Design an enzyme around this catalytic site. Structure first.
Site, short mmCIF file in Angstrom:
data_model
loop_
_atom_site.label_atom_id
_atom_site.label_comp_id
_atom_site.label_asym_id
_atom_site.label_seq_id
_atom_site.Cartn_x
_atom_site.Cartn_y
_atom_site.Cartn_z
N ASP A 178 55.88 32.74 45.98
CA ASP A 178 54.78 33.67 46.00
C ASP A 178 54.94 34.85 44.57
OD1 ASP A 178 52.68 36.62 47.08
OD2 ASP A 178 54.76 36.09 47.78
N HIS A 226 47.13 36.76 48.96
CA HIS A 226 48.34 36.41 48.53
C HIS A 226 48.38 35.24 49.08
CE1 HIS A 226 48.85 40.20 47.80
NE2 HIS A 226 48.89 39.99 46.76
O1 LIG Z 1 33.82 40.18 49.33
C1 LIG Z 1 34.46 38.81 49.30
C2 LIG Z 1 35.54 39.90 48.57
C3 LIG Z 1 36.69 39.12 48.25
N1 LIG Z 1 37.06 37.37 48.25
C4 LIG Z 1 37.76 36.52 48.37
O2 LIG Z 1 38.42 37.41 48.49
C5 LIG Z 1 39.73 36.78 47.45
C6 LIG Z 1 40.16 37.83 45.98
O3 LIG Z 1 41.15 37.87 45.54
P1 LIG Z 1 40.52 38.37 44.19
O4 LIG Z 1 41.23 38.33 42.98
O5 LIG Z 1 38.92 38.17 43.66
O6 LIG Z 1 40.48 40.45 43.79
P2 LIG Z 1 41.68 40.79 45.04
O7 LIG Z 1 43.06 39.90 45.63
O8 LIG Z 1 41.10 41.51 45.71
O9 LIG Z 1 42.51 41.03 44.20
C7 LIG Z 1 43.75 41.52 43.12
O10 LIG Z 1 43.95 39.81 43.89
C8 LIG Z 1 45.04 39.76 43.38
C9 LIG Z 1 45.97 40.58 44.64
O11 LIG Z 1 46.57 41.71 44.52
C10 LIG Z 1 45.84 40.09 42.22
O12 LIG Z 1 46.22 38.97 41.40
C11 LIG Z 1 44.47 40.42 41.25
O13 LIG Z 1 44.74 41.07 40.19
C12 LIG Z 1 43.95 41.91 42.33
F1 LIG Z 1 42.12 41.66 41.66
C13 LIG Z 1 38.85 35.65 46.52
O14 LIG Z 1 39.09 35.33 46.88
C14 LIG Z 1 37.18 35.64 46.37
O15 LIG Z 1 36.32 34.61 46.84
C15 LIG Z 1 35.61 37.05 49.39
O16 LIG Z 1 35.43 35.54 49.25
N2 LIG Z 1 34.59 37.88 49.54
C1 LIG Z 2 48.96 44.19 45.77
O1 LIG Z 2 49.22 44.50 43.50
C2 LIG Z 2 48.78 43.51 42.49
C3 LIG Z 2 49.66 44.78 41.86
C4 LIG Z 2 49.93 43.31 40.83
C5 LIG Z 2 50.89 44.00 39.59
C6 LIG Z 2 50.42 43.45 38.42
C7 LIG Z 2 50.92 41.75 38.72
O2 LIG Z 2 51.30 40.78 37.66
O3 LIG Z 2 50.42 41.57 39.93
C8 LIG Z 2 49.88 41.56 41.04
C9 LIG Z 2 49.59 41.60 41.92
C10 LIG Z 2 49.28 42.57 42.87
O4 LIG Z 2 48.73 41.97 44.48
#
Ligand SMILES: O=c1ccn([C@@H]2O[C@H](COP(=O)(O)OP(=O)(O)O[C@H]3O[C@H](CO)[C@@H](O)[C@H](O)[C@H]3F)[C@@H](O)[C@H]2O)c(=O)[nH]1
Ligand SMILES: COc1cc2ccc(=O)oc2cc1O
Length: 455
Positions: A111, A13
């Site tokens: 956020d 985040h």
């Molecule tokens: O081995 C690694 C692992 C990650 N990263 C970096 O960390 C960030 C991970 O965010 P990403 O959206 O890809 O996945 P993540 O935060 O795990 O999952 C949620 O991300 C958000 C948080 O809930 C949500 O919006 C989304 O739907 C979920 F998928 C992203 O900038 C990657 O480049 C990395 O550089 N190397």
């Molecule tokens: C931390 O797990 C999460 C779950 C949701 C689910 C719905 C959405 O719109 O955003 C999310 C963002 C998150 O970071």
């Protein structure tokens, strides 16, 4: 102008908020300050604060400590609600930090999780916007969820008919966001509450762009039933992403340098993602049997050295074909590399944006959050990804299926067709975020909205 952007506790985040800050600061000369809410406990991002305390340009970071919230949570409490409480209880600290601001900001920022700051934006009378850092579709879902609440009785997941969002695509019950899996769980109530909170802001930023989701954005802008709820502008400002650090003595990149173009499959399940023991073993085999080159970011399974959870002999058999990396790897720098020609991903929006901006196609493997509604979008609508017959979260994906999928993307012509679509997406993303580009134009409309409130 001064804007203050508020970030929630985890790295996942923080980084998107930083990329927004950097974008605004560099391209729009607007002085920015990021109020980063910390965990005041784990703090595995507080060292990143130190690293960022060094090169600040604008780019002024203010750490805000949280409390220990173990008294408001339980093993069974889910992450969504966790985030919600953390900020909720951090509210006073935010209130104090904005008070004692050297120059007042003129504009607040929240956020997805920091929406409950709206109170302290209305006090002190400051312009307030939210940053929805993933799809317009999921935004539409969130807002219209308050109506679904009343229209549907019973659990969403058991429905035989897709959910019809006014204007936007039809959401298959299985591909719902995590909050909607169980209505009896507190995260659901928090979710619908969030949907309502959105509309109270002066405008909503979304890290997508018009060409990606034209119908959905137009729906948000003009659909009558939706506009009964929304009533404020939307700002598609994406796709925003981390910058590349053209890296030298990283052995992954050096490995990749010895491979052919678009011949390596990158496997990563984002920050925090982990498989079952069975799923991980089947995956491992899949990659071996594919006879394809890969980089696999591995963490311990969920249901130590990364060899006890792996097939015996794997690393020696796959030597010179694959490359297995523990916990973290430099994803953006990998994905930008010529030798990378595919991405097995969990479909986190930042991962996806990083992959699409690079023209890399995908194997969608959704796990949590809205990843299922993103996987759907990538595979069905956009045609830049393939997926297993059944959702991985529902059923075990066996080695044969995996080895095929990897084969289909990195050898077959179908794979090349998908790649070509991803390149088109790349180009369209470039054109926006470019002068005259809709996404660039969206900030210029944002900055116009801000200045209008000041006079
Ligand atoms: O081995 C690694 C692992 C990650 N990263 C970096 O960390 C960030 C991970 O965010 P990403 O959206 O890809 O996945 P993540 O935060 O795990 O999952 C949620 O991300 C958000 C948080 O809930 C949500 O919006 C989304 O739907 C979920 F998928 C992203 O900038 C990657 O480049 C990395 O550089 N190397
Ligand atoms: C931390 O797990 C999460 C779950 C949701 C689910 C719905 C959405 O719109 O955003 C999310 C963002 C998150 O970071």
């Amino acid at each position: 102008l001064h804007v203050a952007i508020v970030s929630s506790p985890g790295m996942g985040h923080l980084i998107p908020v930083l990329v927004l800050g950097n974008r605004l600061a560099t391209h729009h000369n607007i002085k920015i300050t990021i109020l980063a809410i910390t965990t005041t406990s784990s703090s595995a991002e507080t060292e990143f604060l130190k690293k960022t305390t060094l090169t600040n340009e604008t780019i002024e970071i203010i750490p805000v400590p949280s409390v220990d919230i173990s008294h408001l949570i339980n093993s069974s409490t889910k992450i969504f609600t966790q985030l919600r409480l953390l900020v909720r209880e951090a509210l006073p600290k935010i209130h104090s930090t904005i008070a004692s601001m050297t120059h007042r900001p003129d504009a607040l920022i929240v956020d997805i999780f920091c929406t409950q700051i709206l109170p302290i934006a209305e006090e002190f009378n400051i312009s307030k916007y939210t940053y929805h850092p993933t799809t317009a579709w999921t935004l539409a879902l969130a807002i219209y969820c308050q109506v679904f609440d009343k229209e549907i009785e019973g659990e969403y997941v058991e429905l035989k008919e897709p959910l019809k969002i006014p204007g936007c695509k039809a959401l298959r019950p299985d591909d719902v966001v995590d909050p909607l899996l169980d209505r009896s769980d507190q995260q659901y109530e928090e979710y619908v509450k969030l949907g309502k909170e959105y509309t109270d802001f002066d405008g909503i930023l979304i890290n997508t762009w018009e060409d990606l989701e034209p119908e959905t954005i137009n729906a948000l802008r003009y659909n009558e039933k939706l506009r009964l709820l929304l009533k404020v502008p939307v700002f598609p400002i994406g796709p925003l992403r981390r910058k590349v650090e053209t890296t030298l003595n990283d052995e992954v990149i050096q490995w990749l340098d010895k491979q052919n173009n678009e011949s390596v499959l990158f496997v990563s399940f984002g920050s925090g993602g982990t498989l079952s023991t069975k799923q991980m073993t089947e995956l491992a085999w899949g990659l071996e049997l594919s006879q394809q080159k890969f980089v696999w970011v591995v963490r311990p399974p969920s249901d130590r050295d990364m060899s006890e959870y792996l097939p015996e002999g794997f690393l020696t058999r796959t030597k010179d074909m694959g490359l297995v990396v523990p916990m973290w790897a430099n994803q953006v720098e990998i994905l930008s590399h010529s030798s990378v020609g595919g991405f097995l991903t969990h479909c986190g929006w930042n991962s996806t944006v990083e992959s699409l901006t690079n023209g890399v196609p995908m194997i969608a493997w959704p796990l949590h959050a809205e990843q299922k509604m993103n996987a759907a979008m990538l595979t069905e609508e956009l045609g830049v990804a393939i997926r297993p017959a059944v959702l991985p979260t529902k059923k075990l994906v066996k080695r044969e299926e995996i080895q095929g999928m990897v084969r289909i993307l990195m050898q077959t012509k179908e794979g090349k067709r998908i790649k070509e679509k991803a390149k088109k997406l790349k180009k369209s993303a470039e054109n926006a975020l470019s002068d005259g580009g809709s996404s660039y134009n969206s900030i210029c409309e944002l900055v116009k909205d801000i200045r209008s409130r000041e006079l």
